Write a structure and sequence with these properties.
With 97 residues, the chain is mainly β. 0% of the residues lie in helices and 38% in strands. It has a four-stranded antiparallel beta sheet, with no helix packed on it. The relative contact order is 0.26. This is IL-4-inducing protein.
């Protein structure tokens, strides 16, 4: 997928994976991937949250970014995911009021 969020079972982008294509407001139980990437490429930008409905801790990933060891990031378990857009200016508007 060109825009999707990639969630890998193992660290450093190994093992089985899941592709996510759009925002999802609750994942139960929470998803605990080893690593997460967004493909290189407007530009997709993804927010991962440790609570449902786009609340809680927030880890964001722009296009071409991998988190190689997601277990060592801000939180281990993803409860919701928001798909956004990063504008040519570099800003992401999807969580703004």
């Amino acid at each position: 997928c060109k825009y999707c969020l990639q969630l890998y079972d193992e660290t450093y982008e190994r093992g089985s994976y899941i592709e996510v294509y759009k925002s999802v407001g609750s994942l139960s139980p929470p998803w605990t991937p080893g690593s997460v990437c967004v493909p290189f490429v407007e530009r997709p930008y993804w927010y991962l949250f440790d609570n449902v409905n786009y609340t809680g801790r927030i880890t964001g990933l722009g296009h071409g970014t991998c988190i190689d060891d997601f277990t060592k990031s801000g939180f281990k378990g993803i409860s919701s995911i928001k798909r956004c857009i990063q504008t040519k200016d570099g800003k992401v508007e999807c969580i703004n009021q």
